[PDB]
Structure formats: C-alpha cells, structure tokens
Design a protein around this ligand. Structure first.
Ligand SMILES: OC[C@H]1O[C@H](OC[C@H]2O[C@H](O)[C@@H](O)[C@@H](O)[C@@H]2O)[C@@H](O)[C@@H](O)[C@@H]1O
Ligand SMILES: OC[C@H]1O[C@H](O)[C@@H](O)[C@@H](O)[C@@H]1O
Ligand SMILES: OC[C@H]1O[C@H](O)[C@@H](O)[C@@H](O)[C@@H]1O
Length: 362
C-alpha cells in the first residue's frame, strides 16, 4: 500500500537536500520567512505523529537562530515577534507543536509572548473586533491573521497556566469571526474584510477563497472543542470542511483532488504554493477529533478518505526524486504545486505543502 510515514520522511529529506541552509539555520532565504515557520511545523508534526526524532537536532538549531531579534524588525525583540501579526502567528503555532512534541516549557513561553504581541493590534473600535495584519499600516483585518490568532489562544487555553483568560479570549475571538461575515453563504471563508467609507462598518471583501483560510480555522475549532468539550465547535468545523470537499465549490476537483484557484491559470505565487498542505494537516486534526468524539467507527472516515485520495494523486502525478551523485548521496522526493498536475519543478513552498499532506495521513 502507501506508507505515508516513509514518504513524509523522504519529502522532508528532499526539502532539506534542496532548500535547507545550514549556515543560516533556515530554508530558502529567498522565500517568505513565514514559510520557513510552516516548514518547521511540518517537520515537528511529522516527528510528533510518527514517533521519530530524526530531525529534532535540526529543528532546535532553526529555533535558536530564528528566535533572535529580526534584522528587519528589531522592535519585535525576537521570540518570533515580527513585522506582521501573521508572520508571528505561524512561528507561534510551531512553538505550540514544539511544546507538544518535547514538553519543554521554553517553547510554550514563546507562544505566550507571541499571543501578547499579536493582541497589541486587536481593536474593538473597527469591525467590532479582530486584529490587523499590517502592523505598520493597520488597513486590513484579513482571515489568516485572525484564524492564526484564534488557533493560538485556543491552543494556549489547553496548555498555558492562566488558561482561563485564553479561553475567554478564544471564545470572544470565535464569536467575532463568526459574526464578521468572512464565512459566506456556502460556509467558505473569503480572504478578509473591507471597511465602509462612509459608515465605518466592515463587510466580507469577496476576495478569493484560499485553501489555508479554510484549514487554520479548523484547528482553532478543534482546540476550542478540546478546551470546552462542546461538539458545536466540531460541527462548525465540519461544515467548513464539508464545503471544501464538495466539488460544487471549486476547491475539490472532479477527481476528488484539492486544487487552489490559481492552479488553473498556473499563477500560484510564493505564498499560495504552500496553502494546500496547511489545509490538509488541519483537516487531519478535525478528522482525528471527530473520530474520537463519537463511538461510531465511521466518524471522520470521509476526511481520512479525502486525505488518502489526495495523497495517492500527489504521489503518482506530482512526484520527482533528486539525482544522487558520487559526492552528494542525499536522497528524497520533490513535489510541484499541483497535486494532480504534472511535476515541472520543486520550490520550497511547494515542498513544504507536500510534506503537510503526507503528515496529514500519518
Ligand atoms: O496570496 C494570498 C494572500 O496574500 C496576502 O498575504 C501574503 C502572505 O503575507 C504574509 O506575510 C504571510 O503571513 C501569509 O499569511 C500571507 O498569505 C494577503 O492579502 C492575504 O490575506 C492573502 O490570503
Ligand atoms: O519573508 C522574508 C522577510 O525578510 C525580508 O528581508 C524582509 O523584507 C521582510 O519584510 C520579509 O517578510
Ligand atoms: O479590500 C480589503 C483589503 O484588500 C487589500 O489586500 C489590502 O491591502 C487592504 O488595503 C484592503 O482593505
């Protein structure tokens, strides 16, 4: 059959052999720094779900160096506090997984510092809530930043000492998100909000439906369920997932393969190349929570069936292997952006998204 653990490791090896920079303790300095954080999450999640620890030394090197005050944002004072709330949020969630893997209070403390940094740009005076993404400009409360923050406070509500204040913040944050309008008529999440020129009220800006904006919210609702034992959160998550799996909504191909909207025009940029893996890994948390929340053995079978279907398509259609040489004995797998289309080339955001799908099936 298909050993997702073996292919995850081969993909991580391929990510490392092509894109990891030993001298910089980071993958691909020419790609968005926040995608290095996503990559770290995938490697941590692989280790956490497979029981292996083969990349734990490497992960710890990356943390120690990216922990330092950023050259492009020294006012953050390190600990991943960067020039945007979504930048910070990706690394914050990686530290939560780091904590889950190791149990070291140190990583949890980074997440606590990051929550407090992000909340600095939560304002109740515009849109009745939510935080801005552009720390320097304060012109956009989008979906990804508030989804990341929501999943952070919901995670802290399950792990941090003053867990109650985080439960209050997460419940208050989910209420704002739900009533914000970003969840549209088919239970998908548009990119962000826009503000009325004359009235100051906000509305769904009808910008694209990105796959990672339907994933991160699922993890937040799963964490909100673990902290409250309220299945209504799982039900809300399940509706967002169900809309994604529905081919009528354009996210799922006629072959049952997840497809970013830019894949058609072949115009997926550095950011959008990683979106799919973020959704898959989050849907795996939904499927796991759903299967355990009920005695039914078929609970979440469709989410697992979906991830499996997508894995075999990416394995057969999107895969390419590195050429070993007399000097470089490094082996592994490389992956392009389309989980059904051909393999043209591999980039770090595409590779990280491939790892996410394999880890989602581990
Ligand atoms: O490509 C769709 C997104 O494009 C814009 O943001 C790009 C990325 O910039 C940030 O630094 C990262 O943290 C990412 O989270 C973010 O996607 C925004 O318009 C965003 O809302 C779009 O979804
Ligand atoms: O993501 C890469 C990261 O490093 C660059 O040097 C800066 O311009 C940042 O604004 C950017 O976010
Ligand atoms: O339209 C919503 C939003 O779209 C853009 O991506 C942002 O740069 C903002 O200027 C604007 O408010």
């Amino acid at each position: 059959s298909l050993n997702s653990t073996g292919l995850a490791q081969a993909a991580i090896n391929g990510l490392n052999a092509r894109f990891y920079e030993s001298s910089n303790a980071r993958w691909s300095s020419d790609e968005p720094w926040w995608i290095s954080g996503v990559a770290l999450t995938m490697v941590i999640e692989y280790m956490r779900r497979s029981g292996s620890k083969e990349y734990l030394d490497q992960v710890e090197d990356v943390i120690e160096v990216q922990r330092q005050p950023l050259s492009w944002w020294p006012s953050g004072e390190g600990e991943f506090r960067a020039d945007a709330t979504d930048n910070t949020g990706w690394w914050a969630l990686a530290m939560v997984r780091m904590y889950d893997l190791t149990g070291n209070e140190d990583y949890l403390n980074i997440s606590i510092k990051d929550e407090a940094y992000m909340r600095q740009w939560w304002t109740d005076t515009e849109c009745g809530g939510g935080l801005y993404v552009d720390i320097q400009d304060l012109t956009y409360k989008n979906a990804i930043a508030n989804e990341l923050y929501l999943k952070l406070v919901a995670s802290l509500a399950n792990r941090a000492p003053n867990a109650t204040i985080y439960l209050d913040r997460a419940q208050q944050a989910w209420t704002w998100f739900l009533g914000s309008g970003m969840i549209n008529g088919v239970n998908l999440i548009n990119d962000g909000l826009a503000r009325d020129s004359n009235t100051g009220s906000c509305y769904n800006n009808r910008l694209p439906v990105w796959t990672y904006n339907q994933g991160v919210i699922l993890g937040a609702l799963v964490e909100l369920y673990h902290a409250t034992k309220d299945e209504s959160y799982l039900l809300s998550a399940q509706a967002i997932a169900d809309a994604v799996l529905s081919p009528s909504n354009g996210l799922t191909s006629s072959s049952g393969v997840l497809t970013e909207t830019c894949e058609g025009s072949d115009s997926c940029n550095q950011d959008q190349q990683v979106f799919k893996g973020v959704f898959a890994l989050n849907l795996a948390e939904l499927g796991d929570a759903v299967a355990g929340a009920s005695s039914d053995p078929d609970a979440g079978q469709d989410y697992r069936e979906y991830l499996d279907t997508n894995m075999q398509s990416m394995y057969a259609n999107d895969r390419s292997e590195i050429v070993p040489t007399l000097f470089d004995s490094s082996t592994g797998d490389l992956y392009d952006v389309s989980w059904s289309g051909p393999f043209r080339n591999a980039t770090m955001p595409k590779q990280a998204s491939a790892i996410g799908l394999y880890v989602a099936n581990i």
